[PDB]
A paper describes a structure:
To overcome these issues, the cyclohexyl group was substituted with piperazine and morpholine rings, compounds 10–12, leading to enhanced solubility. Upon inspection of the corresponding CYP125 ligand complex X‐ray crystals structures, it was noted that elaboration from the R1 position (N of the indole) dramatically changes the binding pose of this series. In the cases of compounds 7, 8, 10, and 12 the ligand is observed at a greater distance from the heme, typically with the pyridine coordination mediated via a water molecule, to produce a reverse‐type I interaction similar to what was observed for the inhibitor LP10. R1 position are observed significantly closer to the heme iron, with compound 10 observed at 2.4 Å from the distal water. This is likely attributable to the ability of the additional carbon to facilitate positioning of the ring closer to the plane of the indole, as opposed to compounds 7 and 8 which extend at an angle of 67° from this plane because of the geometric requirements of the single carbon linker. Later compounds such as 10, 12, and 19 have been optimized towards the observed pose of 7 and 8 in CYP125, with changes that gave improved solubility also allowing more favourable interactions with the more polar environment around Asn203, Glu204, the carboxyl oxygen of Arg99, and the N−H of Trp414.
Breakdown is then initiated with the conversion of the C‐3 hydroxyl group to a ketone (cholest‐4‐en‐3‐one, cholestenone) by the oxidase ChoD, and further oxidation at the C‐26 “tail” region via a three‐step process involving oxidation to the hydroxyl, aldehyde, and carboxylic acid species. These sidechain‐modifying reactions are catalysed by the cytochromes P450 CYP125A1 and CYP142A1 (CYP125 and CYP142 hereafter). Comparison of the effect of complementing a CYP125 knockout in the CDC1551 strain of Mtb (which does not express the CYP142 protein), with CYP125 or CYP142 reveals that the two enzymes are functionally redundant with respect to growth on cholesterol. Here we present a series of compounds based on an ethyl 5‐(pyridin‐4‐yl)‐1H‐indole‐2‐carboxylate pharmacophore which bind strongly to both Mtb cholesterol oxidases CYP125 and CYP142.
Residue numbers in the entry: 18 to 428
The structure:
């Protein structure tokens, strides 16, 4: 029996996510077709012209694909499952220059070098300054009495995390943040005028200039670790550092932001959990917020050979799209997946991807950012209450909130 879905339904359709998360549709696939061919009409495949893709809705299947990276490739078609329908193939293939869209051994080399900037010591070194700025952001917002939670609470701390990691001077953080915000969302009418191509080029240019500068005058910031050769002589070229910075500007910006915004949305929806959070401040809340928020709705892979997955024959060359938003609510893995529970432990969500070679290198930096900001929100506006409904982002792979009006004072 075929799943009860509208004819021609596309789970990557940005017009859906601009309005809602298709929670009932995902649940229908998990019940009636956990692996399901999502057909795509000509010129409607978001930049891919192969007829469609396999929708992956179960967490165990998401994990299996992510582990078998020898079969399921990031490089072949990139991992983003939706661009503008008119994008040129060359604009998809330029993304193979960032680590996210590489396969081994190229990915293995880069990941080893970049891992020197995400050690627990390097990330933990950002704790104090990020805590300081989290407290300042919440106090500034609470003083305004009411406003846009997305812009006054959620936006700044993730960007300051990227800036602190890279050792960007305060005078430059303004344009760095601008370039980051110009990277994503070009399919929402509100951001129709942004040029991610142009920003990418400016970001790389800024980063290359920074790499050259930082070789002359090293410090402890991870940038020196990245461009300093090891015993094997392995290090990031200047253009490699540039493509890494472009990746950070995207990877750690709107992801953590939307986790913050949708975490607070859940707290407003579940006051018992908010009261529990304010009293205990449990750091397990961060993982439940990421599971609930699932900022990356979906990433794709391409099969390099025929592969049988959960009784379904995946053919060489076909795309599989891992819907993290479906897997993070998989009934077989979670007890009461649709209960927001900040104490859930263990919490094997795939908000940071499935375990494997590409697992989010910034997961713990993200968890620290989330924990610090919600401690500050609890410290400074414990009775904030929504004013109106959130405005969702028109995107086929990013689950974003553009605006959300809140009374930080309550009355
Ligand atoms: C709530 C926040 C975040 C979420 C939901 C998230 C999600 C993800 C996902 C789904 C992937 C792909 C994993 C896979 O394909 O198996 C990924 C990879 C990555 N993330 Fe994050 N991320 C977050 C925060 C961050 C931050 C703060 C940083 C850095 C400052 C970061 C840096 C990266 C990088 C560099 C990769 C590429 C790793 C690779 O391809 O080997 N992420 N992330
Ligand atoms: C400085 C290094 O980066 C670039 O030049 C650059 C960044 C970029 C981003 C997108 C894009 C794609 C999708 N959604 C947002 C942005 C597209 C093209 C991009 N290009 C150049 C493209 C050509 C590829 C090879 N032939 C000459 C140039
Ligand atoms: C060529 C320079 O690099 C890029 O253009 C680039 C880097 C990058 C990193 C992530 C990511 C996200 C989350 N966790 C890790 C990495 C996602 C997308 C990325 N893009 C493409 C931007 C496009 C903007 C328009 N809509 C389609 C996507
Ligand atoms: Cl986007």
């Amino acid at each position: 029996p075929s799943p009860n879905l509208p004819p021609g339904f596309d789970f990557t359709d940005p017009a859906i996510y601009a309005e809602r998360l298709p929670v009932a549709e995902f649940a229908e696939l998990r019940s009636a077709a956990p692996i399901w061919w999502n057909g795509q009409d000509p010129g409607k495949g978001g930049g891919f012209h192969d007829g469609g893709f396999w929708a992956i809705t179960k967490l165990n299947d998401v994990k299996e694909i992510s582990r078998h990276s020898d079969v399921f490739s990031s490089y072949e078609n990139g991992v983003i499952p939706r661009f503008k329908n008119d994008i040129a193939r060359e604009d998809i293939e330029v993304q193979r220059f960032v680590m996210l869209n590489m396969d081994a051994p190229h990915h293995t080399r880069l990941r080893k070098i970049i891992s020197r900037g995400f050690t627990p010591r390097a990330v933990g070194r950002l704790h104090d300054e990020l805590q300081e700025r989290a407290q300042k952001i919440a106090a500034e917002a609470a003083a305004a009495g009411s406003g846009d939670f997305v812009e006054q609470v959620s936006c700044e701390l993730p960007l300051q995390a990227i800036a602190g990691l890279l050792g960007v001077p305060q005078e430059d953080r303004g344009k760095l943040f601008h370039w980051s915000n110009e990277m994503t969302g070009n399919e929402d009418p509100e951001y129709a005028h942004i040029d991610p191509k142009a920003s990418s080029a400016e970001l790389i240019g800024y980063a290359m200039k920074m790499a050259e500068e930082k070789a002359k005058n090293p410090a402890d910031d991870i940038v020196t670790q990245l461009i300093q050769a090891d015993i094997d002589g392995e290090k990031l070229s200047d253009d490699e550092f540039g493509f890494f910075v472009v990746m950070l500007a995207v990877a750690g910006n709107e992801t953590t932001r939307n986790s913050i915004t949708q975490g607070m949305m859940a707290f407003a929806e579940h006051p018992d959990q908010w009261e529990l959070y304010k009293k205990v401040r449990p750091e397990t809340a961060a993982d439940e917020i990421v599971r609930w928020a699932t900022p990356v709705t979906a990433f794709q892979r391409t099969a390099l050979r025929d592969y049988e997955l959960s009784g379904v024959q995946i053919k060489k060359g076909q795309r599989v799209v891992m819907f993290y938003r479906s897997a993070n609510f998989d009934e077989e893995v979670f007890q009461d997946p649709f209960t927001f529970n900040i104490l859930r432990n263990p919490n094997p969500h795939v908000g940071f991807g499935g375990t494997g070679a590409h697992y989010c290198i910034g997961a713990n930096l993200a968890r620290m950012t989330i924990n610090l900001i919600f401690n500050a929100v609890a410290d400074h506006m414990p009775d904030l209450k929504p004013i109106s409904a959130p405005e969702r982002l028109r995107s086929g792979w990013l689950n974003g909130i553009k605006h959300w009006q809140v009374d930080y004072t309550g009355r």
